[PDB]
Amino acid sequence: GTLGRAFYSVGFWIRETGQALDRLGCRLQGKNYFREQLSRHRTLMNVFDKAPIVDKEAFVAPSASVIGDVHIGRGSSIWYGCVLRGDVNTVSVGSGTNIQDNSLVHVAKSNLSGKVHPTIIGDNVTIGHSAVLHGCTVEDETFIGMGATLLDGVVVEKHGMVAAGALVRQNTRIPSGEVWGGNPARFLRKLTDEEIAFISQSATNYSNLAQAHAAENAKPLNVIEFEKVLRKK
Amino acid sequence: QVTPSPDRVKWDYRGQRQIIPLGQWLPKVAVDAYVAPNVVLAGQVTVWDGSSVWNGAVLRGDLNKITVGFCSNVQERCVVHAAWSSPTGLPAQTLIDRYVTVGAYSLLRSCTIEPECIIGQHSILMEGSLVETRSILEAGSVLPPGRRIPSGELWGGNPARFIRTLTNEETLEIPKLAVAINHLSGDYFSEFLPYSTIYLEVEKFKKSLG
Amino acid sequence: MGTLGRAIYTVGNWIRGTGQALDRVGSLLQGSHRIEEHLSRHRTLMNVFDKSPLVDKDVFVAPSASVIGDVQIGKGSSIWYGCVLRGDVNNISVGSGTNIQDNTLVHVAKTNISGKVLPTLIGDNVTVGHSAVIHGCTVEDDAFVGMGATLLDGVVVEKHAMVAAGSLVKQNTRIPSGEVWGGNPAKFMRKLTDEEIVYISQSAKNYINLAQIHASENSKSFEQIEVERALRKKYARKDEDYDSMLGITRETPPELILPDNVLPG
Amino acid sequence: GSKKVSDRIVKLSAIDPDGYKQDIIGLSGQTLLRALTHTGLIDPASHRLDDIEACSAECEVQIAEEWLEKLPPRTYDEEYVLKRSSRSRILNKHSRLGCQVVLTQELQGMVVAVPEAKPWDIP
Amino acid sequence: KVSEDKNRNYAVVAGVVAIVGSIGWYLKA
Amino acid sequence: PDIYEGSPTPVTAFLSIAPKISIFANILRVFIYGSYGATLQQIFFFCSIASMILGALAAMAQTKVKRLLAYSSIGHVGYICIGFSCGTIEGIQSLLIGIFIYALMTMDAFAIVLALRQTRVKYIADLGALAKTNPILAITFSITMFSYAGIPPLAGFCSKFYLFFAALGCGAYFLALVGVVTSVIGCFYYIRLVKRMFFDTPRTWILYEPMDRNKSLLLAMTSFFITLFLLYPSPLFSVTHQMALSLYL
Amino acid sequence: VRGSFLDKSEVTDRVLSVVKNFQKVDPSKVTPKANFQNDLGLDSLDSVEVVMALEEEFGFEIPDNEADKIQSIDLAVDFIASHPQAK
Ligand SMILES: C/C=C/C(=O)SCCNC(=O)CCNC(=O)[C@H](O)C(C)(C)COP(=O)(O)OP(=O)(O)OC[C@H]1O[C@@H](n2cnc3c(N)ncnc32)[C@H](O)[C@@H]1OP(=O)(O)O
Ligand SMILES: CCCCCCCCCCCCCCCCCC(=O)O[C@@H](COC(=O)CCCCCCCCCCCCCCC)COP(=O)(O)OCC[N+](C)(C)C
Ligand SMILES: CCCCCCCCCCCCCCCCCC(=O)O[C@@H](COC(=O)CCCCCCCCCCCCCCC)COP(=O)(O)OCC[N+](C)(C)C
Ligand SMILES: CCCCCCCCCCCCCCCCCCCC(=O)O[C@H](COC(=O)CCCCCCCCCCCCCC)COP(=O)(O)OCCN
Ligand SMILES: CCCCCCCCCCCC(=O)SCCNC(=O)CCNC(=O)[C@H](O)C(C)(C)COP(=O)(O)O
Ligand SMILES: [Fe+3]
Ligand SMILES: [Zn+2]
């Protein structure tokens, strides 16, 4: 709370002072390595006490940005370049859900347009490449086509489908078993049973692919590449 | 034939540099502007007081100047670029004026946005296009090359079309949205001290290798 | 050097210890809530399923780009900031002199719903605009894909064809040579003038030139970065009148001068 | 898109102090000074606002009477600025302050003479 | 192990002398 | 005015302060310590009235910052010379107090001007929207202007107070008249700057680069002095009475 | 008051006289719109001659990449009537 923020702020004063002292010590020894421009990107970023809670069995690509109060369930995957920002409100991702590369899942930055809605993503959900989810609810076993945009107040009911590149306007409800697409998004047709099977199997395949990529990324950083970068001329 | 190089860097311990100079073209960031750590600014980019650039955005001023004005915001995964020239014959720098809200996932190339405008999420503004002051573009709008959004109007669609004229209360709300986003960016700005402590990690990683 | 040097070094060690202790105390006071910044774990090039990307010598790959798995990139091509090329379940092939612009996603599929699943094939001298999505489709040589365009599985963009900015190209759609398609869903708009064909070619070569300066800057070491920072600061302003009084002429160092092929003229 | 920048573009010609004629471009509703600054015919740094209170005739242009009839008459303040900024303290009858001339569709094809730049950058 | 910049070391000594001499100046006045 | 505007701004700042100190030292020790008498005090009387009137009017005419400050300084030397004219220990003391306070205010004003010269400030209108782009700088500059206008309880109120104190007592009702008129004119052209920074809504804004540490510290100290001097004015009052007495003893 | 452009009527009369008294132009086809080549029986050498005559009478040089458009008396008068260097 307020006391917590006061101590967090005072803490920054002490830390700023200690780091300055360390730089002074390095300068007396003739070292300038603290001047190196190194990336300050954090895969998980806190905003005061609002911090991401990530299940141990969830893959998060290192280049992804998870900011604030974000929940990721078991078997879920956050792919390369994804951005998830829950600060004004929360974002929750269920188990077995894939958020594909370069997707954006965020909440309203300000309450000017009304109360900021949270973003709720259920279980075994597929969110396509470069999709935008803004303060919406996405129920279990639904499909969000890649490049689609879902605005705040939208509800995608279970087994709903949002076609690739669709623009679902504010407060639109997508009924179960229906395919909606276009700008604005409109009813296109009903979902077939084969499509439901593909929804489930594609989700299970993504969880296995996630496993493979998490093992790949978890390997120790190669020291030969480090030495090559250090010894460049 | 695809002949690779054995010396190409596969993993760079420094990560992507945020500030990419290009000859003498050095990106200029105001001391009271928030730029997210993974943003890339390259070349002729100026980010003014009170403005903010959010995670995953790319601002590449290698063909012309890019300017983000006072208390304006370029939100997540936006790409801002520019060309040598515009089809309209006007100069082709990308000008984002003051109190402008550029919605997330928006693509801007050699466009002008006059003061106090809102660009909806996932919008595209093409070469030589112009958004006049106190106008709003709906999410998913596509503005083709050299097209104009007249002042005081709400537009939208692919391609964008007139929807309705804005009320004075609505147009009064636009700088308020810009100010609120700046207020939010202050919280992120307060999380970063002037220096990082990564260099210590680099030091011990070096020492463990001798 | 000498005894004074050693003593000052030891005092610096003491000051460093004190500073790091103060930093730890300040971290404790913050309730340990601050997640610490760490060494970058992003890999520009990565193997998966024992597939290594094949990237030609003179290819600009931005450090923030992600090239993963079975990906081939030809001579003179460029992969820009934030691009993701994920060749994990299938093959991605990029021809020569082709630019993949910032924040673009290229992906493939293991098995499509129906038909023959095909790799992602991007030809020679192709421009792919910012934040495009290329998924399991084929772009032939000298084609243009607009910024923010989406190509779904089985799409074929033919030689000298254009996909407009913002378009959504539905699965298995064919864009014939000489036409421009756009919209959501994408559909025929008009024929491509000869001047626009020349534009497409010009786009490709301009990118080839831009890639050189970006690759040169992104590959510089710490020492060269510092040297150029100092040089840039020194030559940012001038007093030519005092130089004329001194009878000297300050010249811009060559490491701050861009090549003429990227200058507006 | 039913509303283009081409709808507001005003075709213009400017004669530089060396006498050479140039075809320049400006928007309707903006000032002649802005159109002149687009290509550097007048240094934008020398006249950054379009206000008469921030003007020392750095925007001054000479226009023939055929186009002068199509403009509003010079105000008292404009003539004051022009006269005092003259080296000889003489008011030129074809002189206009470029910052006070708003471009319109009726000014298509107007010819404008840009005199030699006066010193502007006070130590 | 050793700081090698001789001029930097001399400047460090000068700053230390200034600080200590200022303390002594206050103390003995 | 011409020299002040045309010189490099640091030169203008230096010329605005130090030579006045030195030459008033000289004037005190020559005239005050010497003896022709009423003729010379009348000289400074007539020149003071002329300087106040012309400074006020010409400053009201100015559209540029430097010229405005030059004419302001001319008017203030008129106010100061009123003290030399009345030929009393309190007159000398008030002249010294006026020089000290004018010097610290001029230092404040030129620190702001030098800070703004990094973006080439030239016209008063160039200050538009400054209360938005740098609120604490717009407030600081406003305090300087109100002090220049002599609004109490800012430090600048001391010179206005002695101007009227010397007129009412010596019997000079025309001088008091002139002081009232010129003070009101001065207040108008000083608050015009505040209006430009706080009330105007221009279409084009100028964004100014933040000042360096030296000018920020100097500005911070001079701004506390200007706001808080009349809470603890005893040292200046005593030191200046001391100086006035030391001219003859 | 001092001006910067010659009057339109004065320039019209001056150019009309110059063309009328040139060498091979009967002062009866010389109208304020008459074309040099189609309507005055003047070849390209003679039209260049006339344009060079326009330079002497108004005391300034017309750019080579601009003289190619002065083909009649109306285009001429349009050019010189707005050129500040004209005297
Ligand atoms: C130096 C660097 C070089 C590079 O690499 S450039 C890469 C970045 N830039 C880009 O990707 C943008 C490429 N240019 C384009 O996409 C562009 O639009 C485009 C080139 C198709 C079309 O631009 P045009 O100026 O040629 O537009 P048209 O004259 O053909 O207008 C036809 C029509 O299509 C509509 N319009 C046109 N543009 C588009 C679109 N896109 N979509 C949908 N609808 C449109 C428009 O409303 C028009 O009116 P209506 O049909 O009556 O409604
Ligand atoms: C284990 C318990 C002991 C803990 C001790 C903590 C005491 C620390 C107190 C803080 C002192 C702050 C002093 C501020 C001045 C900063 C001095 C400095 O920066 O050192 C510089 C310069 O030093 C000097 O020129 C003179 C000042 C040095 C004297 C004070 C040093 C403080 C520690 C004392 C170390 C010497 C003690 C032993 C001497 C034999 C080193 O040289 P450069 O890298 O070339 O300088 C670059 C420019 N810049 C200033 C921006 C960094
Ligand atoms: C009564 C006097 C006579 C009349 C004259 C009045 C003159 C003023 C006119 C009044 C009308 C309204 C004025 C509004 C001003 C209030 C707003 C303001 O000044 O806030 C400043 C605050 O300005 C200041 O900094 C004022 C500091 C003065 C310090 C004086 C106090 C001295 C002792 C205090 C000790 C320290 C604090 C103790 C508690 C922590 C914020 O400045 P910004 O430009 O918005 O941002 C600053 C940047 N940043 C916040 C990131 C640091
Ligand atoms: C009376 C009313 C109330 C007043 C309040 C009194 C309170 C006392 C003041 C307390 C000061 C608080 C801050 C102290 C810590 C700051 C230490 C300064 C750090 C420093 O070394 O500054 C350097 C610059 O010098 C500087 O910036 C110092 C010069 C500053 C100008 C002031 C002194 C000038 C000489 C005397 C003027 C007298 C005028 C009066 C007529 C380097 O700075 P950097 O490392 O950031 O690099 C700048 C880029 N070059
Ligand atoms: C004081 C003087 C100093 C300088 C003296 C210089 C003396 C130079 C003497 C030599 C000059 C020449 O003959 S230079 C050579 C000139 N010869 C030609 O041009 C032959 C081709 N003929 C034509 O082009 C046309 O018959 C023509 C009528 C010319 C124009 O075409 P039009 O029919 O479409 O008007
Ligand atoms: Fe002007
Ligand atoms: Zn995919």
Give the integer Cα–Cα distance in Å for G3 and G84.
9
Give the integer Cα–Cα distance in Å for A186 and C184.
13
Quick one: CA dihedral B105, B111, B115, B120, positive or negative?
negative
Q: Whose CA is nearest to atom 42 of ligand 4?
A: F213
Give the integer Cα–Cα distance in Å for F105 and C68.
65
Give the integer Cα–Cα distance in Å for B21 and C230.
13
- All residues of chain C having their beta carbon less than 8 Å from the beta carbon of residue B77 are 103, 131
Which residues span the domain enclosing A152?
2-3+6-7+37-218
Give the integer Cα–Cα distance in Å for C223 and A230.
10
Written as six digits, the tokens of B21 are 């100079």
The full 3-state SS of chain D, as one line of letters, equals: CCCEHHHCEEEEEEECCCCCEEEEEEECCCEHHHHHHHCCCCCHHHCCCCCHHHCCCCCEEEECHHHHCCCCCCCHHHHHHHHHHCCCCCCECCEEEHHHCECCHHHCCEEEECCCCCCCCCC
| Distances in whole angstroms, Cα of residue F36 to Cα of each of A138, F40, F90 | 98, 7, 21
Whether C141 and C166 have beta carbons less than 8 Å apart is answered as no
Whether A164 and A150 have beta carbons less than 8 Å apart is answered as no
The minimum CA-CA distance between D123 and chain F, rounded to whole Å, is 4
Do the domain assignments include residue A24? no
Closest CA to F176 of F21, F52, F54: F52
Q: Which chains touch F (3 or more CB pairs under 8 A)?
A: B, D
Number of domains in chain A: 1
Which residues form the pocket of ligand 2, taking CB atoms under 6 Å from any ligand atom?
A 24, 27-28; C 7-8, 11, 14-15, 17-18; E 8, 11-13, 15-16
In chain G, the N- to C-terminal Cα span, in Å, equals: 16
Written as six digits, the tokens of F26 are 């000289």
Nearest atom in ligand 4 to the alpha carbon of residue F103 is 41
Give the integer Cα–Cα distance in Å for G44 and A21.
85
Distance from the Cα of residue F217 to its chain's centroid: 21
Q: Which chains touch A (3 or more CB pairs under 8 A)?
A: B, C, E
Q: State the Cα angle at C244 between C241 and C249, rounded to 5°.
A: 110
For residue E10, the ligand closest to its alpha carbon is 2
Backbone angles phi, psi at F45, to 5 degrees: -60, -55
Q: Who contacts C83 (Cβ-Cβ below 8 Å, separation ≥6)? A: C62, C65, C66, C100, C101, C102, C103, C104, C105, C106
Which residues span the domain enclosing G77?
3-86
Place of tokens 């090329």: C85
Closest CA to B2 of C52, C118, C94: C94
- All residues of chain B having their beta carbon less than 8 Å from the beta carbon of residue A40 are 18, 37, 192, 196, 198
Written as six digits, the tokens of F238 are 């005593």
CATH number of residue A122's parent domain: 2.160.10.10
Give the integer Cα–Cα distance in Å for D66 and A156.
67
Number of domains in chain G: 1
CATH number of residue C128's parent domain: 2.160.10.10
**Half-sphere exposure (CA, 13 Å, Cβ side) for C103?**
33
Closest CA to F151 of F65, F227, F237: F227
Which residues form the pocket of ligand 4, taking CB atoms under 6 Å from any ligand atom?
F 107, 212-214, 217-218, 221, 224-225
Q: Would the CB of G45 count as within 6 Å of ligand 5?
A: yes
Which residues span the domain enclosing C181?
45-195
Resolution for the entry shown, Å: 2.1
Written as six digits, the tokens of F192 are 């015009």
- Technique that determined the structure: cryo-EM
Place of tokens 């967090």: A8
Place of tokens 């000083």: F190
Give the integer Cα–Cα distance in Å for G14 and F38.
74
**Read out DSSP for C213-248?**
HHHHHHT--HHHHHHHHHHHHHTSS--HHHHHHHT-
Q: Who contacts D78 (Cβ-Cβ below 8 Å, separation ≥6)? A: D52, D96, D97, D100
Whether A162 and A154 have beta carbons less than 8 Å apart is answered as no
State the maximum Cα–Cα separation within chain C, in Å, rounded to a whole number.
Answer: 81
Whether F208 and F197 have beta carbons less than 8 Å apart is answered as no
Give the integer Cα–Cα distance in Å for E27 and F16.
41
Whether D56 and D86 have beta carbons less than 8 Å apart is answered as no
Residue A1, helix vs strand vs coil: coil
Closest CA to B15 of C41, A60, C214, C53: C41
The region, left, alpha or beta by phi > 0 then psi within -120 to 50, assigned to residue C176 is beta
| Distances in whole angstroms, Cα of residue C108 to Cα of each of C46, C87, C117, D64 | 16, 7, 9, 66
Whether D52 and D97 have beta carbons less than 8 Å apart is answered as yes
Backbone angles phi, psi at A137, to 5 degrees: -115, 135
Do the domain assignments include residue A19? no
CA F136 to ligand 3 centroid distance, Å:
7
Give the integer Cα–Cα distance in Å for C161 and A115.
46
- Nearest CB to B9; choose among A19, A41, A225: A225
Place of tokens 């050095």: B26
Place of tokens 């030191």: F239
| Distances in whole angstroms, Cα of residue D53 to Cα of each of A114, A117, B199 | 43, 49, 53
**Which positions in chain E have a beta carbon within 8 angstroms of at least one beta carbon in chain C?**
1-4, 6, 9, 12-13
Do the domain assignments include residue A117? yes
Q: State the Cα angle at C222 between C218 and C225, rounded to 5°.
A: 65
Give the integer Cα–Cα distance in Å for C208 and C202.
10
Quick one: CA dihedral C215, C220, C224, C230, positive or negative?
positive
| Distances in whole angstroms, Cα of residue A207 to Cα of each of A92, A201, A212 | 18, 10, 9
The region, left, alpha or beta by phi > 0 then psi within -120 to 50, assigned to residue F151 is beta
Written as six digits, the tokens of B42 are 């390259």
